Design goal:
Elements (H helix, E strand, L loop, with lengths): L1 H13 L2 E8 L4 E5 L5 E2 L5 H14 L7 E4 L17 E4 H10 L3 H10 L3 H10 L25 E2 L1 H12 L6 H12 L17 E8 L5 E8 L6 E8 L9 H12 L3
Antiparallel strand pairs: 1-2, 1-9, 3-6, 4-5, 7-8, 8-9
Helix pairs in contact: 1-8, 2-3, 2-4, 2-5, 3-4
Family: Belongs to the class-A beta-lactamase family.
Catalytic activity: a beta-lactam + H2O = a substituted beta-amino acid
GO molecular function: beta-lactamase activity
């Protein structure tokens, strides 16, 4: 398709490795570029951790209001929200919001612990049919994004399907699903990524991700005004360990996808 040639040309111009998966829910059509290759998830993994806690709250009705202590030792490299509550508490809801909307790494680590470790996040993925997702480490080491390293990776295809189920399908209860959508729609870190490649009139909920090897990711649900929603995953990684983020590549990929729908 014209789109796959344009995505290939974008990738060639960028010097990196680009992975894209679009699902059009209007007709369930998929557009894939390196859709079955593994990419480091980085902070896009935080969606699965939040969704797993949400699933727990279906049975533990009060779980999200459970206070969790933030101790100094819990603080890692990037904790914009947890920092504000050191030696205090945050609820599991507040921690979920912080992980998704501010990409707080301490918050993410508290969610993993609530789930009994990285194996508890991966287990939820398997439970909802994602056999590709694997979370092996905690923050910040899950962001090393070493070429060839299968730890803490997924594929664009797999993440797109899973993100659809969590947000548009019924992998989660109705209330949990809505809460996740509300959290994603209030993301604050995505203005320069997928959102920058799309019409301003479209509503977007997304979770960005970044790590070493210039890894620059964004996963998003898109509600075009007067049209079925779309799921768009864009993964991008580069061959130099100290490469700079390339959020423009994600916007450009979104723009190329928008040209055709």
């Amino acid at each position: 398709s014209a789109v796959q040639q344009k995505l290939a040309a974008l990738e060639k111009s960028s010097g990196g490795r680009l992975g894209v998966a679009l699902i059009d829910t209007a007709d369930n059509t998929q557009v894939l570029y390196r859709g079955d290759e593994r990419f480091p998830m980085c902070s896009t993994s935080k969606v699965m951790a939040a969704a797993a806690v949400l699933k727990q709250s279906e049975t533990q009705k009060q779980l999200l209001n459970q206070p969790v202590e933030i101790k100094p030792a819990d603080l890692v490299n990037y904790n914009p929200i947890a920092e504000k509550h050191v030696n205090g508490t945050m609820t599991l809801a507040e921690l979920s919001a912080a992980a998704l909307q501010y990409s707080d790494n301490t918050a993410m680590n508290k969610l993993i612990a609530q789930l009994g470790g990285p194996g508890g996040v991966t287990a939820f993925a398997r439970a909802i049919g994602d056999e590709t997702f694997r979370l092996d480490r905690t923050e910040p080491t899950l962001n090393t994004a070493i070429p060839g390293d299968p730890r803490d990776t997924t594929t664009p295809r797999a993440m797109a399907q899973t993100l659809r189920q969590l947000t548009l399908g019924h992998a989660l209860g109705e209330t949990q699903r809505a809460q996740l959508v509300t959290w994603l729609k209030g993301n604050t870190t995505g203005a320069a990524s997928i959102r920058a490649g799309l019409p301003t009139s479209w509503t977007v909920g997304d979770k960005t991700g970044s790590g070493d090897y210039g890894t620059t990711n964004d996963i998003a649900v898109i509600w075009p005004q007067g049209r079925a929603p779309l799921v768009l995953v864009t993964y991008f990684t580069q061959p130099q360990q100290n490469a700079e983020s390339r959020r423009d590549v994600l916007a450009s990929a979104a723009r190329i996808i928008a040209e055709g729908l």
